[PDB]
JSON list of C-alpha atoms in Angstrom, two decimals:
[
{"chain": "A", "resi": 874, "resn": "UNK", "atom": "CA", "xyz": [37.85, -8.22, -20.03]},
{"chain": "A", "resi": 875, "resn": "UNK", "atom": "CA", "xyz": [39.47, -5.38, -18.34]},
{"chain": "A", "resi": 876, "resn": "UNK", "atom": "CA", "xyz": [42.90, -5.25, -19.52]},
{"chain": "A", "resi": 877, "resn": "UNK", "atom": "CA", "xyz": [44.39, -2.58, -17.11]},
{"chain": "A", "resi": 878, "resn": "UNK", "atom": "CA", "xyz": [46.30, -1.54, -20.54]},
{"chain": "A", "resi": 879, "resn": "UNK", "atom": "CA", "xyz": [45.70, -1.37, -24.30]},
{"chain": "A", "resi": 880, "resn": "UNK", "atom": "CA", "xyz": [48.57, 1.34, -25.98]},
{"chain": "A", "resi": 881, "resn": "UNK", "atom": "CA", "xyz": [50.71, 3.80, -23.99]},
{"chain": "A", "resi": 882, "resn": "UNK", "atom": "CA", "xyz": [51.79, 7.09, -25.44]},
{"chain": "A", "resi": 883, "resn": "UNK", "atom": "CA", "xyz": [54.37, 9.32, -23.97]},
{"chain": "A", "resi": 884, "resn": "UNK", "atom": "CA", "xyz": [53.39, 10.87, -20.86]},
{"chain": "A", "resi": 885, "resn": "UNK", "atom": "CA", "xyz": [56.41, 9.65, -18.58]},
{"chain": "A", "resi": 886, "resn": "UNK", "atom": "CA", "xyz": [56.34, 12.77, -16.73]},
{"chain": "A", "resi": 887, "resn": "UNK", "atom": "CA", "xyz": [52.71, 12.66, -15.93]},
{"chain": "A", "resi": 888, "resn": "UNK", "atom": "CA", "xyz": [53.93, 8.58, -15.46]},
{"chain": "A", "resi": 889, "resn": "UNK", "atom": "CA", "xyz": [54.64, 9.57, -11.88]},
{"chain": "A", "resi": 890, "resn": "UNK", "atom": "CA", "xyz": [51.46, 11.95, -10.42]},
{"chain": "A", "resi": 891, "resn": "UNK", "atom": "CA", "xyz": [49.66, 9.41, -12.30]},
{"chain": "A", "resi": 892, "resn": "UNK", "atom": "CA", "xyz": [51.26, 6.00, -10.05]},
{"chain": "A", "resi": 893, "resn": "UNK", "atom": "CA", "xyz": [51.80, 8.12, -6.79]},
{"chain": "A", "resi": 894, "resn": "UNK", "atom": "CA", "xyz": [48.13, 9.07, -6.71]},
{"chain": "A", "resi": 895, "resn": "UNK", "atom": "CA", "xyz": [47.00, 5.64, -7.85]},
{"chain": "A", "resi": 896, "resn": "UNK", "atom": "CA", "xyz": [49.17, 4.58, -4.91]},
{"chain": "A", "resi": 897, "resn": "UNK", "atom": "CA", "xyz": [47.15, 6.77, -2.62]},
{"chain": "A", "resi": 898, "resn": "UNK", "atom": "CA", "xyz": [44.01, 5.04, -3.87]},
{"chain": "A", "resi": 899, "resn": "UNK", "atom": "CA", "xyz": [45.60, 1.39, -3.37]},
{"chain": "A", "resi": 900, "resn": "UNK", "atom": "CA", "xyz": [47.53, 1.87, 0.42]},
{"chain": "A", "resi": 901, "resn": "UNK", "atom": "CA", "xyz": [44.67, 3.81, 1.86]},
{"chain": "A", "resi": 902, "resn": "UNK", "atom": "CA", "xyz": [41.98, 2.18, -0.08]},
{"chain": "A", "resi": 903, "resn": "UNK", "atom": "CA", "xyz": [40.53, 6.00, -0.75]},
{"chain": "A", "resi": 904, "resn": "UNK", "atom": "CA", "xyz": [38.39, 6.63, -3.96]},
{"chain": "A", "resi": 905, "resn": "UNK", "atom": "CA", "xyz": [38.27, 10.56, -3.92]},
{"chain": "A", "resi": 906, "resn": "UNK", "atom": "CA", "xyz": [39.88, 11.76, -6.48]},
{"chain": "A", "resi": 907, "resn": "UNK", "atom": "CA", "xyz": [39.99, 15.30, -5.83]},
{"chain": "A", "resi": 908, "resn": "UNK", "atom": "CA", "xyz": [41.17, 14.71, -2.19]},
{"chain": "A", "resi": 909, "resn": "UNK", "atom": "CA", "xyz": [44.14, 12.70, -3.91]},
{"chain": "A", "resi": 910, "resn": "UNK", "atom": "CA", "xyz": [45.59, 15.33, -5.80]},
{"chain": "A", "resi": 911, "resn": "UNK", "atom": "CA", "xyz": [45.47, 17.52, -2.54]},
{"chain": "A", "resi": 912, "resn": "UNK", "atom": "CA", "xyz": [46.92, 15.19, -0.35]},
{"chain": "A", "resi": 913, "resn": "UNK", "atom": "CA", "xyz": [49.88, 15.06, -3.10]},
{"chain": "A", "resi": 914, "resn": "UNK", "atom": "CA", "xyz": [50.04, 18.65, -2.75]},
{"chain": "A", "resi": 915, "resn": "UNK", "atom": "CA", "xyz": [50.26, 18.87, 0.99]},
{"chain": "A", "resi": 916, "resn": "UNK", "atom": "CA", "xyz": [52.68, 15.73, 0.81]},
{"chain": "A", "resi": 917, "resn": "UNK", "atom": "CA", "xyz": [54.75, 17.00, -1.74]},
{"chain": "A", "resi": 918, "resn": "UNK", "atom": "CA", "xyz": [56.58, 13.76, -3.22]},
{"chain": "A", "resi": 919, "resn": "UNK", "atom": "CA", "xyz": [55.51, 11.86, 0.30]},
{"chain": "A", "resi": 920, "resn": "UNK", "atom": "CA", "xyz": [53.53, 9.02, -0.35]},
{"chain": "A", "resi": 921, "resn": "UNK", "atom": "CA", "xyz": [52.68, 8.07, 3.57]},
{"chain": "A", "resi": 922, "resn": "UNK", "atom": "CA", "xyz": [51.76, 11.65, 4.29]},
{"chain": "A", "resi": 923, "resn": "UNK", "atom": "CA", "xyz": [49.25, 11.70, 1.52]},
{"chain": "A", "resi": 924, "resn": "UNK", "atom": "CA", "xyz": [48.05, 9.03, 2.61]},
{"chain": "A", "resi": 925, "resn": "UNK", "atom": "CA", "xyz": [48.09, 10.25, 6.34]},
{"chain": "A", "resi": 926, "resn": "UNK", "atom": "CA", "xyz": [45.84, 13.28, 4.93]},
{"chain": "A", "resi": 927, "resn": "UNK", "atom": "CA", "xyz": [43.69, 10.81, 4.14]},
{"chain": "A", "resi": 928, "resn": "UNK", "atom": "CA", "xyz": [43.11, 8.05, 6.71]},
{"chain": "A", "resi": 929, "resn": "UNK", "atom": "CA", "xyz": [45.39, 10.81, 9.07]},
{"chain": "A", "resi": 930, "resn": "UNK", "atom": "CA", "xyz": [43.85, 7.86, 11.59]},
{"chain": "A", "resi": 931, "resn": "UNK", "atom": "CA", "xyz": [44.16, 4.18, 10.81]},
{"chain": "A", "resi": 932, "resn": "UNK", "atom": "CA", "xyz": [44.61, 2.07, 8.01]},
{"chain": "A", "resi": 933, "resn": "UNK", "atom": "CA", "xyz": [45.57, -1.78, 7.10]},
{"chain": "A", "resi": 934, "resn": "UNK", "atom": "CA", "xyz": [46.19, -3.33, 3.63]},
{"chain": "A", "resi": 935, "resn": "UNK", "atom": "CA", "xyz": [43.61, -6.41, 2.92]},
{"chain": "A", "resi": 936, "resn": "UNK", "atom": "CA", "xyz": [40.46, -3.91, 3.19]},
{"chain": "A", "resi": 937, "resn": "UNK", "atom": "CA", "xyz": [39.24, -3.32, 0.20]},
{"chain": "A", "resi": 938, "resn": "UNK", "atom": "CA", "xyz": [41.33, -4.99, -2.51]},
{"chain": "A", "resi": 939, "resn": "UNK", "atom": "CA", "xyz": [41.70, -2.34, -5.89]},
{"chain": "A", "resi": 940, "resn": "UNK", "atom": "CA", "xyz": [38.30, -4.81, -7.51]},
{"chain": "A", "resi": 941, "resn": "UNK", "atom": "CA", "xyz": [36.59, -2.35, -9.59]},
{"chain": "A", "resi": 942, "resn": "UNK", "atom": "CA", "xyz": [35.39, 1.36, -10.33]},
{"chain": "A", "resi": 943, "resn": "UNK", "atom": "CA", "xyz": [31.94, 1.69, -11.52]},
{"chain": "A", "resi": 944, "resn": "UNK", "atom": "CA", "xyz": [28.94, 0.43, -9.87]},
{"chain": "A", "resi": 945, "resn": "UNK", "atom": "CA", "xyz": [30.60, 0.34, -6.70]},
{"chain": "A", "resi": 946, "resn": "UNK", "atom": "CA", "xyz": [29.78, -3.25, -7.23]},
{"chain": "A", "resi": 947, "resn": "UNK", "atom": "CA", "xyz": [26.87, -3.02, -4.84]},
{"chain": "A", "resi": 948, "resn": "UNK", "atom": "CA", "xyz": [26.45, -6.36, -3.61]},
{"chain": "A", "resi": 949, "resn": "UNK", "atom": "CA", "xyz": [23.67, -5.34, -1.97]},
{"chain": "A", "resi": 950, "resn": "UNK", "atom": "CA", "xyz": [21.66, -2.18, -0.50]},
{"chain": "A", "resi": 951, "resn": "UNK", "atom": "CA", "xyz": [20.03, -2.90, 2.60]},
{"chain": "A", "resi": 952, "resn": "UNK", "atom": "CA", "xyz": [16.44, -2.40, 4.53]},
{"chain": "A", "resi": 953, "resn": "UNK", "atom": "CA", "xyz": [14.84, 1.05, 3.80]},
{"chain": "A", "resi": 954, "resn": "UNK", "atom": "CA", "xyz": [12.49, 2.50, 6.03]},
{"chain": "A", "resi": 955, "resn": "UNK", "atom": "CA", "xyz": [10.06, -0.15, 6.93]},
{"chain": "A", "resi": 956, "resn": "UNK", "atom": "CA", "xyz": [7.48, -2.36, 5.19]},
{"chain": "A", "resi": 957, "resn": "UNK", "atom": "CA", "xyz": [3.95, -0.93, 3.83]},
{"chain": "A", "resi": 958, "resn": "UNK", "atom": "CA", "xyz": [1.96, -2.49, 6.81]},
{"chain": "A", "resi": 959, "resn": "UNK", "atom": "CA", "xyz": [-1.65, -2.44, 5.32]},
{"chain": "A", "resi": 960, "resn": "UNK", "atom": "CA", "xyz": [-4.99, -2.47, 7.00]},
{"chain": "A", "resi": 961, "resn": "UNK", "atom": "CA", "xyz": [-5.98, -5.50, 8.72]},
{"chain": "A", "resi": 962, "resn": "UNK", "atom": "CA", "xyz": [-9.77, -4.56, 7.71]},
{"chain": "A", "resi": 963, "resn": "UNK", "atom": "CA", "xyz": [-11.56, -8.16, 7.98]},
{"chain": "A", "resi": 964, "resn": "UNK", "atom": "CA", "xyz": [-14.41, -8.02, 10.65]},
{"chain": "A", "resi": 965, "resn": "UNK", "atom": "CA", "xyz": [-18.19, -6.74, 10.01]},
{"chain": "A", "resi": 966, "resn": "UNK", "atom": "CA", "xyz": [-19.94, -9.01, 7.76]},
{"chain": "A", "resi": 967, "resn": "UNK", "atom": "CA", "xyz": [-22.09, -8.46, 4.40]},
{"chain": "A", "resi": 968, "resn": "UNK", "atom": "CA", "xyz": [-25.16, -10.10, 4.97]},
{"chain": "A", "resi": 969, "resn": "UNK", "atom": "CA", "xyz": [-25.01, -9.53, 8.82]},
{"chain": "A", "resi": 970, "resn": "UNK", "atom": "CA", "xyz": [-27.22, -12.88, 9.40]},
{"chain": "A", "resi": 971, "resn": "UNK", "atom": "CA", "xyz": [-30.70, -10.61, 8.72]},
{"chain": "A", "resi": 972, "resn": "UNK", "atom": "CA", "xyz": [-33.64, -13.21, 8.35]},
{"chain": "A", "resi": 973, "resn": "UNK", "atom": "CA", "xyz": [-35.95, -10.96, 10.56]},
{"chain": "A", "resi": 974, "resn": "UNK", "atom": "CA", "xyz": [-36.72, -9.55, 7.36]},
{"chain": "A", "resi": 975, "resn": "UNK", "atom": "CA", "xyz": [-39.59, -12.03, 6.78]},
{"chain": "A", "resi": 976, "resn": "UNK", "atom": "CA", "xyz": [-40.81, -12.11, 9.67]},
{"chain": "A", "resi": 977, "resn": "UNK", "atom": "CA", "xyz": [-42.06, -8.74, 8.66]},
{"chain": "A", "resi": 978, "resn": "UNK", "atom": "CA", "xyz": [-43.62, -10.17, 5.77]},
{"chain": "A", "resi": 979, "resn": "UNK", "atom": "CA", "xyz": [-45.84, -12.31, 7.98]},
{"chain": "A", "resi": 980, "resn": "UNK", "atom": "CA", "xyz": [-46.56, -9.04, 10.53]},
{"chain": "A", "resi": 981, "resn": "UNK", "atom": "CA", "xyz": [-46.83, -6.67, 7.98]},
{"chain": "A", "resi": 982, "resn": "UNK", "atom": "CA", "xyz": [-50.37, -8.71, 6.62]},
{"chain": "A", "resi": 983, "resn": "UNK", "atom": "CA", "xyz": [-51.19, -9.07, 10.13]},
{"chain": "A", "resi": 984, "resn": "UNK", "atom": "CA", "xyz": [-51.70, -5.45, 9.74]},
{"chain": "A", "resi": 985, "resn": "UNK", "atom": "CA", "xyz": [-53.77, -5.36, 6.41]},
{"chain": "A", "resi": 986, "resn": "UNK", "atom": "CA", "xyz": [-56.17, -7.77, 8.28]},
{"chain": "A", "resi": 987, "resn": "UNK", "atom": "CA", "xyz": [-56.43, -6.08, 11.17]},
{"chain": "A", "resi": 988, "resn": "UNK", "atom": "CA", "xyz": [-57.54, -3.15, 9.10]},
{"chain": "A", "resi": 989, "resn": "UNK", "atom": "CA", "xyz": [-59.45, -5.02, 6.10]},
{"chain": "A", "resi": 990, "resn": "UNK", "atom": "CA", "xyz": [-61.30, -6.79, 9.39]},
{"chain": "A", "resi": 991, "resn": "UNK", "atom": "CA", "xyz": [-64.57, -5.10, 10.88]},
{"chain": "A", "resi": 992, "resn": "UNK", "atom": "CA", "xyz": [-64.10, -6.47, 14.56]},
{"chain": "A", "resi": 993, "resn": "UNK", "atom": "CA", "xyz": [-67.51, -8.06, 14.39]},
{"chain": "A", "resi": 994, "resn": "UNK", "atom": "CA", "xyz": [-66.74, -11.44, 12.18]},
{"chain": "A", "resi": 995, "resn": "UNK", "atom": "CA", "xyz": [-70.38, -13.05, 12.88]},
{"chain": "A", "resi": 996, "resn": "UNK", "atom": "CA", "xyz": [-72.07, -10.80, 10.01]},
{"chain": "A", "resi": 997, "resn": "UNK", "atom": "CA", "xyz": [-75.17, -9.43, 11.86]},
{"chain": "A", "resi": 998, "resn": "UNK", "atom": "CA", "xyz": [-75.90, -7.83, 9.00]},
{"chain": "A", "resi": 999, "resn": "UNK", "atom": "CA", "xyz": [-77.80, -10.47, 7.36]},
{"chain": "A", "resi": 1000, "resn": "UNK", "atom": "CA", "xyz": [-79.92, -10.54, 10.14]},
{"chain": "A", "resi": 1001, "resn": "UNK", "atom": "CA", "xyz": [-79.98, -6.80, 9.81]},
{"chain": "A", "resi": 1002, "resn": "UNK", "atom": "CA", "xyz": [-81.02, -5.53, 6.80]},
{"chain": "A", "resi": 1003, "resn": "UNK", "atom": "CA", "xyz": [-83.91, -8.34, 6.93]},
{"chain": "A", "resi": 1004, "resn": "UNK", "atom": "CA", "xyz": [-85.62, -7.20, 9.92]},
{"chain": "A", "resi": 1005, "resn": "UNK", "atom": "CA", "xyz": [-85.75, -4.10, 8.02]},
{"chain": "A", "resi": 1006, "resn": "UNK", "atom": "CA", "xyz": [-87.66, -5.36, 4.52]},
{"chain": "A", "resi": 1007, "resn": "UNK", "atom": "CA", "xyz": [-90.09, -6.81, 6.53]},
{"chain": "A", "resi": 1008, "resn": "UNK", "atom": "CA", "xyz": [-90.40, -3.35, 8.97]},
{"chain": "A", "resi": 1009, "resn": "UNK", "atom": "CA", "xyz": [-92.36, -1.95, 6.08]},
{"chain": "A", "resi": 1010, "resn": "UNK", "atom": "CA", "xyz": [-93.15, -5.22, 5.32]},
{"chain": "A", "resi": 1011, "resn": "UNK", "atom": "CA", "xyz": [-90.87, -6.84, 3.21]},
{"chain": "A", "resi": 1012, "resn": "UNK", "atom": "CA", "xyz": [-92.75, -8.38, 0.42]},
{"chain": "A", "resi": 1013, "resn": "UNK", "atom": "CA", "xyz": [-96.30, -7.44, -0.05]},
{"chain": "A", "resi": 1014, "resn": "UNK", "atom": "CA", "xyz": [-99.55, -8.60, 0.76]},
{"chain": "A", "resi": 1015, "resn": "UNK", "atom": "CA", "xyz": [-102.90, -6.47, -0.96]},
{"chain": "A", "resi": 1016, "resn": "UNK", "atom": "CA", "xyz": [-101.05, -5.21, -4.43]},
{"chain": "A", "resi": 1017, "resn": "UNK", "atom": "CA", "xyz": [-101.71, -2.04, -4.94]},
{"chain": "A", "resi": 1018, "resn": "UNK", "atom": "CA", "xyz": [-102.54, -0.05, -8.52]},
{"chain": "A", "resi": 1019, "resn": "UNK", "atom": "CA", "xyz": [-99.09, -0.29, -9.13]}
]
């Protein structure tokens, strides 16, 4: 897949920069290219030194094994901040168990009675307005010219 060659041409000067620096990135595991060239610099021909200028600390072999050069091959990120952690809205209620409502239907008539009602109920009147016909008399006895 990744044939580490394909067709050299001349360049057997460069041959050397080219496998001391890729040594740098193999012994100390480093990836900085740019660092590299100025830890050759500062070494001047010293391979351990450039590397020193590196790691100038520690260092082992088995760490990170020359694999690839791309992607990093990522084989995996990690947790970010946090999750999202929505509301936990799920209380109140929609219809709020409201059946007083009829029981204003019923009251609210008990008002248009009380109000179409005339507090009497035994209708007097009758009584009434007869005493009254007869008062002049109700009916007639002697006709007159009329």
């Amino acid at each position: 897949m990744t044939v580490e060659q394909n067709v050299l041409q001349q360049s057997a000067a460069q041959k050397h920069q080219q496998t001391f620096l890729n040594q740098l990135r193999e012994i100390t595991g480093i990836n900085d290219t740019q660092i590299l060239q100025q830890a050759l610099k500062d070494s001047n021909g010293n391979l351990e030194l450039a590397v020193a200028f590196l790691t100038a600390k520690n260092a082992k072999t088995p760490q990170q094994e020359e694999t690839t050069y791309y992607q990093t091959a990522l084989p995996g990120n990690d947790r970010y901040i946090s999750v999202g952690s929505q509301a936990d809205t799920n209380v109140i209620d929609l219809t709020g168990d409201d059946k007083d409502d009829l029981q204003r239907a019923i009251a609210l008539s008990l008002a248009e009675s009380n109000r179409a009602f005339r507090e009497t109920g035994i209708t007097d009147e009758e009584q009434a307005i007869s005493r009254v016909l007869e008062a002049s008399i109700a009916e007639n006895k002697a006709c007159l010219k009329r």
